Write a protein that binds this ligand. Structure first.
Ligand SMILES: O=c1ccn([C@@H]2O[C@H](COP(=O)(O)OP(=O)(O)O)[C@@H](O)[C@H]2O)c(=O)[nH]1
Ligand SMILES: O=c1ccn([C@@H]2O[C@H](COP(=O)(O)OP(=O)(O)O)[C@@H](O)[C@H]2O)c(=O)[nH]1
Ligand SMILES: [Mn+2]
Ligand SMILES: [Mn+2]
Lengths: 492, 495
C-alpha cells in the first residue's frame, strides 16, 4: 500500500489520454484534456467564509467511510477525488475510502487505485447504477458514519470536520457541503454562493433557490450556521450509517441515475430527520449538462420511472401535480413499490402535506381548479404588469422565466389574474386598452377563455381577443378576433 | 342647516361648469366634465372582501371629526366627498366635518357647503398649504378622533367603523383605508389591490410594494386583518386627536404639498406608534399625474425642501442614501429644524436604524462603505443575473425597478456583487464572457472601477470594460474600452 503522494499519476492517467486530434468531451461530457493536465493534488482556492478559516475544528469526532461509486470515470478526475479526500481530511477520521466500480469498461481504473492507502475497491460484475452501487458501498462500510461523494469532486480545506460535528451531535441530521463548481470546460474551481437552499418545481427536477431576504437577515448574526434545506443535491452528503440503514438505505429498484435525491430527501424529512447545508464545508464538483454513460431504455424513461417511484410512495395526492407538469410520466411503468410503502408505515412518517407546510412552504401550490398557469407567452415576449397596480395598463417584456410581474393564472372563475388583480375589459370598443382591477367573481368584464387550441385569449361573450399591437404605445388592448400574430398567447 | 339630500347639487355645481369648447382637464388635472355628470351620492361598487361584508365591531365607538382641506377643488368632487362621508357613516360617529378652505379663488366653494348638516368651514386668509391647513382643522376639532380626507374622495360601505375600532382599542395606531382608484379620465370607481403595503425607494418617493409570499401565507387564516405598513399614502387616515397633538401634529414649516407623509410615518413608528392599512375600510381617491395648483418656488423645490426636513430630522446617517439618489437635493435650503429635533428628544424616539430593521426590513440598505448601489442601467436595460448562480453568465433585461436579479452593489472591495456572487473576469482576451463567482476580497479578477464620470465600468489594472454587445448571444463580456453604447453603465445610487 502506497501513501498518496508516492502514487504515480503519470503512469495511471497516461495511456487513457485524449489521443491527438480526438474529441476531448466525448468520453466524459467534460473536457478530459483539461482534467488530465491537472496534478492529482492541485491547489484550489479557499472558498470558505472568513469565519470558517479562523475556527479551530474538533477532531474528536467519529471516523467516516467514504463511498465513491463510478462508471467510466476519467482516471484523472477519480484519482483527484481520492487524493483530495486523503490530503484534506484528518487521517484518523478517514476509516477507509470504498470505491464501488460500477462495471467500468476497464477494471484497472479502480484496481490500480487499490494500492493507495485506505482505498478498498469493490467491482460490480454487471451494471447496477448509482443507487445499488451506493448501498453496496454502505453495506461494506466499517465506520459509524457514511460520506458519499461523486467520482469527480475536490474537497477543500477542513471540509470534513464541520459535517461530522453535525451528525455526531444528532444522528438524524443528513448534511451536505456547499458544492463549489469545477468548470466542465476549463476545470477552474469556482466558489459557489452560500445563500442557496435546494428545492424543486412540480416537474420534480432539482433546482437551487436563493434564500428569501428575511432568511438572509435572520442569519446576519451567524452567517456560517447550518442551513436547513428541503432537498439535497444528492451526490455529496454525510449520514450516520445506522440511521441510513434504519431509514431504508435507498430504493433498490431505482436504476442508473436520477430521483434518488428526491426520495431520500422526502423520506428523511417526513420520517423525523433533517437535511442541512453546512457552509464551512466546501467541496467542488464537476457539473455537466449531459450524461456520458448508457441508460437501459433511454434517460428520459429511467428518470421518470425513478421519479414516479418517489412520487407514488411519498407525495400522497400531491403526486398529481407532478403528473400535471409531466403528463408523459403517467405511461411509464414503475414496478412494485410494496416494500417502500411498508417502510413508510413501519417508520410512522408524516404526510406530504406536512412536508409542504413545515419544510418547503415557499413551493407554490396551484389552486386545484386553475385552468392554466405560469407565464403568458407571445413569441419571446411575456404578459407583464409593468409594475402597475389597479387601474393600470398591462404590457409585455421579454420572457425572463423568473415569475414576478410575468406570473399569471387562468382561474376556475375564467379570470386572468396576477396576485388579486385581473385583466379587465373596461371598454369593448376595438382598440381600447385593458386594465388591471381587483378581481371579482361576478364581473363579466374579467372573463376570458382560451381558443384555437389554447393559442389565443378571447373575452367571454364577445368577439374580442387580447392583443399586443399597441403594447409599446399605451398597453395591451382588446381587438376584434382575427388572424394576427399580436393575438397569439400561450400559458407555459 | 340642511340635510344633505335637500342640498341643491345642480345650483352648487352649475356656474363653475366647463365652458362650451374649453379644456376639461386644465382647472383640476382630472376630467371635470365627467366629475360634474355624477350625482352627489352616486352609487359605487362595494369593493370590500366578502368577509368584511358580514363583520361586526364594538359599536360604542368614539365619534370623529373629519378634516378635509382644499384649494380650488372642483365643486362636484368636493360635494361628493362631503356627502359620501354623511351618507356612508353612522350619524352618531360623525361629530362634524371641518372643511379648511386653503385660500381658494372663490370663497363660495366652501361657504355654500356650510349650510349642510355637520359641516363647518374655516377659510385661510392666505395660502397655507395642506400641512398647516390640516393642523388648523385638527386644532378646531371637538371629537376624540381625527379623520383626514382629501377633497376628492368617495367613502364606501362601512368605511369608518373598522378604522375607529383600531384606534379605540389602541390610541397609538394611525390607520388608513385601502385606497380605491377613482379614474381621473372617466371617474369610474375601481377596486384596489388589498395585497399592498406602502414604502419607498431611497429617493424618498412613496410607492406601493406587494407583500412578500411569506407575509401573504401568514394571513391565509384572516385575509382582512390589519396590515402594518412602513408608510401611509398620507391623505386618508384616522388618528387619536390627543396622540396627534402629543406626537407633534405636522411640521408647520412644510409648504403646499409633499413629504409630510414621510415625516409622520417615520415619526409615528420611531416614537412608539404604528401605521396600518385596514382592508375592510375602502375609500376611493382621484389619483392624478400632475398638480393643478401653484407652488411658491416650483414643485420640484418644495417637495425637496419638505423631504429634506423629514430626512434631516428622522433618518440619522441614512439621509446620505437619499442624497446619493437625489444629489440635487443637497443644494435646496430647508430652514430651521430645531423644534422638530427637540420634539424627537422629548419623545425618546428610536433611531432610523431601528426603523429599517423592525418596520421596513425589505428596503434594501447599502453597506455603509459601498461605493455605488441599486440597479446598473444601460439605456432602459439593467444588469441581470438571468437567474444564474456561480459559474454562470450574466446579461441584461428591461429594468423593472423591482430588485431581485437586478440588485447590485459596487463594494468597498471594488467588486460588483449580487448576494455573495461577484462579476468575475475569467479571461482577459477581448470578447471573453464574464462569470458570476463567489466573492473573495483577494481575487484581482473581481475588481472594477467607475470611469468617465461614473458612466462606464473598467476592470481594474486593465483596459477592459464591461460590455453588452454579446448579451443575447452568450452574455456580458469584457471588451477593449472604447466609445460604444454597449459599454455605458450607471448605478442608480452613487455615494
Ligand atoms: O450507472 C452509474 C451512473 C453513475 N454513477 C456514478 O454516480 C455518480 C453520480 O453521477 P453523475 O455525476 O453522472 O450525476 P450528477 O452529479 O451529474 O447528477 C458519479 O460518481 C458516477 O460516476 C455510477 O456509479 N453508475
Ligand atoms: O396647497 C394646498 C395643496 C393641496 N391642498 C389639498 O390637500 C389635499 C391633498 O392634495 P393632493 O390631492 O394634490 O395630493 P395627492 O393625493 O395628489 O398627492 C387636497 O384635498 C388638496 O386640494 C391644500 O389644501 N392646499
Ligand atoms: Mn456528478
Ligand atoms: Mn389627493
Amino acid at each position: 500500500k502506497v501513501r498518496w503522494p508516492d502514487f504515480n499519476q503519470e503512469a495511471y492517467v497516461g495511456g487513457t489520454m485524449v489521443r491527438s486530434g480526438q474529441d476531448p468531451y466525448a468520453r466524459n461530457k467534460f473536457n478530459q484534456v483539461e482534467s488530465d493536465k491537472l496534478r492529482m493534488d492541485r491547489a484550489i482556492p479557499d472558498t470558505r467564509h472568513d469565519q470558517c478559516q479562523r475556527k479551530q475544528w474538533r477532531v474528536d469526532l467519529p471516523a467516516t467511510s467514504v463511498v465513491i461509486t463510478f462508471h467510466n470515470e476519467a482516471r484523472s478526475a477519480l484519482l483527484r477525488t481520492v487524493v483530495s479526500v486523503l490530503k484534506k481530511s484528518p487521517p484518523h477520521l478517514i476509516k477507509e475510502i470504498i470505491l464501488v466500480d460500477d462495471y467500468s469498461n476497464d477494471p484497472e481504473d479502480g484496481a490500480l487505485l487499490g494500492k493507495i492507502e485506505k482505498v478498498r475497491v469493490l467491482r460490480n460484475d454487471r451494471r447496477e447504477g448509482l443507487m445499488r452501487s451506493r448501498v453496496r458501498g454502505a453495506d461494506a462500510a466499517q465506520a459509524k458514519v457514511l460520506t458519499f461523494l461523486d467520482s469527480h469532486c475536490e474537497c477543500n480545506e477542513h471540509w470534513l470536520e464541520p459535517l461530522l460535528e453535525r451528525v455526531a451531535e444528532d444522528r438524524t441530521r443528513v448534511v451536505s457541503p456547499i458544492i463549489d463548481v469545477i468548470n466542465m470546460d476549463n476545470f477552474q474551481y469556482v466558489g459557489a454562493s452560500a445563500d442557496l437552499k435546494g428545492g424543486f418545481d412540480w416537474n420534480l427536477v432539482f433546482k437551487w433557490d436563493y434564500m428569501t431576504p428575511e432568511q438572509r437577515r435572520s442569519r446576519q448574526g451567524n452567517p456560517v450556521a447550518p442551513i436547513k434545506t428541503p432537498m439535497i443535491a444528492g451526490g455529496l452528503f454525510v449520514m450516520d450509517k445506522f440511521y441510513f440503514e434504519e431509514l431504508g438505505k435507498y430504493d433498490m429498484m431505482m436504476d442508473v441515475w436520477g430521483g434518488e435525491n428526491l426520495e431520500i430527501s422526502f423520506r428523511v424529512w417526513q420520517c423525523g430527520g433533517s437535511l442541512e447545508i453546512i457552509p464551512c464545508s466546501r467541496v467542488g464538483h464537476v457539473f455537466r449538462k449531459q450524461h456520458p454513460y448508457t441508460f437501459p431504455g433511454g434517460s428520459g424513461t429511467v428518470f421518470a420511472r425513478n421519479t414516479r417511484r418517489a412520487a407514488e410512495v411519498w407525495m400522497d395526492e400531491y403526486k398529481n401535480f407532478y403528473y400535471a407538469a409531466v403528463p408523459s410520466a403517467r405511461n411509464v411503468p414503475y414496478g412494485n413499490i410494496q416494500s417502500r410503502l411498508e417502510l413508510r408505515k413501519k417508520l410512522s412518517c408524516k404526510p406530504f402535506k406536512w412536508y409542504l407546510e413545515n419544510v418547503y412552504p415557499e413551493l407554490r401550490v396551484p389552486d386545484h381548479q386553475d385552468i392554466a398557469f405560469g407565464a403568458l407567452q407571445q413569441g419571446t415576449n411575456c404578459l407583464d404588469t409593468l409594475g402597475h397596480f389597479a387601474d393600470g395598463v398591462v404590457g409585455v417584456y421579454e420572457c425572463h422565466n423568473a415569475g414576478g410581474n410575468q406570473e399569471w393564472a387562468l382561474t376556475k372563475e375564467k379570470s386572468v389574474k396576477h396576485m388579486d388583480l385581473c385583466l379587465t375589459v373596461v371598454d369593448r370598443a376595438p382598440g381600447s386598452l385593458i386594465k388591471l382591477q381587483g378581481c371579482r367573481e361576478d364581473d363579466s368584464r374579467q372573463k376570458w377563455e382560451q381558443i384555437e387550441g389554447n393559442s389565443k385569449l378571447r373575452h367571454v361573450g364577445s368577439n374580442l381577443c387580447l392583443d399586443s399591437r399597441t403594447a409599446k404605445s399605451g398597453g395591451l388592448s382588446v381587438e376584434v378576433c382575427g388572424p394576427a400574430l399580436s393575438q397569439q398567447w400561450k400559458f407555459t
